[PDB]
Each structure stands twice: as structure tokens, then as C-alpha cells.
Design a protein around this ligand. Structure first.
Ligand SMILES: Oc1ccc(/C=C/c2cc(O)cc(O)c2)cc1
Length: 276
């Protein structure tokens, strides 16, 4: 599928940089015809078939195809796509309140009410995605953006569909692999993957929200991955002594090695810690 090949600068002006990663940079921008503001994600294309730099056309097209399906208050949306010889440029919805990661670095730990206010929105977004058989595969606090961080109960949107896949057979076997602290054991073990992997990541996020600590983090990536595969985590009393047993139960039923025994998104919404 081809994208708009007019110069994006003919239609948008860019401003502050929002972040950058291995293959992409995101810049705030403003559409000239409407004055409306967006986030332009410039993804570097692969320059040869066998290269390891840049992102393959197949991978870019997958991210775009999934994003085109999405319209939900808790998930980022896609406005337009441009391309030139060097980049594909996604014109994404602008969510300007910063990463949940940075919000957490300030509070250092959330109350259960604050955590569940965020988690209910994350669960609602993931429920929408999983209902469409979309596995995100990269859920973590850096990929949850706040609309406005200066309100008591910030609203959020899930971002970053660079690893997302449609799961139309119940599992995909593609060597998908995200951030070690957040990947499920089936990712670590290179096993068939499905929607269940996201539910594990939600368990990790919840543990972090409540404690400020990462459940599986070792001193090296290989230690973290070994800890994940072995389900090597525990609720440290220093962090969790005043946390409810029901909150621990919610986490415990997500950090389950066997994907078939792990809570699904629907289970998580009915769990007594979440359900009103
Ligand atoms: O509306 C938005 C759409 C996308 C983004 C992306 C921000 C971002 C943050 C990082 O730490 C690294 C990165 O590569 C990108 C921010 C807002």
C-alpha cells in the first residue's frame, strides 16, 4: 500500500520533539489547513532488502493497517500517512501530557485509587484492542500517554503500535519481542503468542504502579528474561505492606506462566479489585 508522497512540509509545520527511538522520531506538528495539532512519527525505511537498519515495509504497513482500524478514547488514532524515499511519516493524534512513565517518576508510587483510575482506562483500551483481535505486544508505562497531567485523575491513551499484530488464529508465531521487563514468558521462550501476552504486561504495569518497583528486573537483560521465564517475582513487604490483598490477587492472576490460565481482558474487568 502506498502513502501520500507530497512533501509533508507543504501541509504541516513541525515544532517540539516529543521523543525518539531506534528507528523513529516524533515531532509535534500543526496542520496548515486547520490549525489542528498532531504528532508526526518519522519512521526510517530500510534501504536494501537484507539490511538491518530502518524498518521493513512489511512492518511499517502492519503498524499503519492496525492504526487505521482504531477509534477509541483510550487508544491513539491515526490522522494521515505520508512517505518519501527515506521515511514513512505517521500523522498521529497529539496527546501532550507526557508518558505515564514520567508521571510515575514524580509520585514514585500510586495509591490503589490512583492506580485503578489509570488501570481502568488501560483495561478499557486493551478491551477494545483485544475485541478486534489486536495484540499490542509493547505495553509499558512509556507507551501510555496522559492527555493532561495537571488534573487529579489524568486521562490516558495507549500508543506505539510498532509491535502490534492481528491474532486471527488465536496465536502468532513470528519472533515478536519487546522490552525485557514487560514481556511475557512465552515471548522470552519464543513460543506462539496471542492476546494473553498483553495481560501479563498489564500485571507488570500494575505491580509498578502500586510499588514503584519492577517485579522481574535484574542487573542485566538476560537476568530479567530468566526471571520472567521462571516467574521469579514476589511482593516485597516494604513496598506492599499497606496494599490490599485483592490488589495482590489481581496481579497474581496476571503473572501466570501458562497463558491459558492467565486472566483475560474480560476476566480483568470482572475481577473484584476492578469491578464496581
Ligand atoms: O501524541 C503522541 C504520539 C506519539 C508520541 C511519542 C513519544 C515518544 C516518547 C518517547 O519516550 C520515545 C519516542 O520514540 C516517542 C507522543 C505523543
Amino acid at each position: 500500500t502506498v502513502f501520500r508522497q507530497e512533501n509533508v512540509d507543504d501541509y504541516y509545520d513541525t515544532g517540539e520533539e516529543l521523543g525518539s527511538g531506534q528507528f523513529a522520531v516524533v515531532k509535534k506538528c500543526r496542520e496548515k489547513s486547520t490549525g489542528l495539532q498532531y504528532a508526526a512519527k518519522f519512521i526510517k525505511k530500510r534501504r536494501t532488502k537484507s539490511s538491518r537498519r530502518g524498518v521493513s515495509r512489511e512492518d511499517i504497513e502492519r503498524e499503519v493497517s492496525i492504526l487505521k482500524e482504531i477509534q477509541h478514547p483510550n487508544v491513539i488514532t491515526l490522522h494521515e500517512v505520508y512517505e518519501n524515499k527515506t521515511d514513512v511519516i505517521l500523522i498521529l493524534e497529539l496527546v501532550a501530557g507526557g508518558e505515564l512513565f514520567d508521571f510515575l517518576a514524580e509520585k514514585e508510587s500510586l495509591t490503589e485509587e490512583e492506580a485503578t483510575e489509570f488501570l481502568k482506562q488501560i483495561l478499557n483500551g486493551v478491551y477494545y484492542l483485544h475485541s478486534l483481535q489486536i495484540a499490542h505486544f509493547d505495553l509499558k508505562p512509556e507507551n501510555i500517554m496522559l492527555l493532561d497531567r495537571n488534573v487529579p485523575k489524568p486521562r490516558i491513551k495507549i500508543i506505539d503500535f510498532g509491535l502490534a499484530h492481528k491474532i486471527d488464529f488465536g496465536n502468532e508465531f513470528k519472533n515478536i519481542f519487546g522490552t525485557p521487563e514487560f514481556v511475557a514468558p512465552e515471548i522470552v521462550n519464543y513460543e506462539p503468542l496471542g492476546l494473553e501476552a498483553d495481560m501479563w504486561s498489564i500485571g507488570v504495569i500494575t505491580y509498578i504502579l502500586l510499588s514503584g518497583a519492577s517485579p522481574f528486573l535484574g542487573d542485566t537483560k538476560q537476568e530479567t528474561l530468566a526471571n520472567v521465564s521462571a516467574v521469579n517475582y514476589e511482593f516485597e513487604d516494604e513496598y506492599f505492606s499497606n496494599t490490599s490483598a485483592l490488589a495482590k490477587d489481581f496481579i497474581r492472576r496476571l503473572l501466570v506462566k501458562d497463558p491459558k490460565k492467565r486472566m483475560t481482558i474480560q476476566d480483568s474487568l470482572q475481577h473484584p479489585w476492578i469491578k464496581p
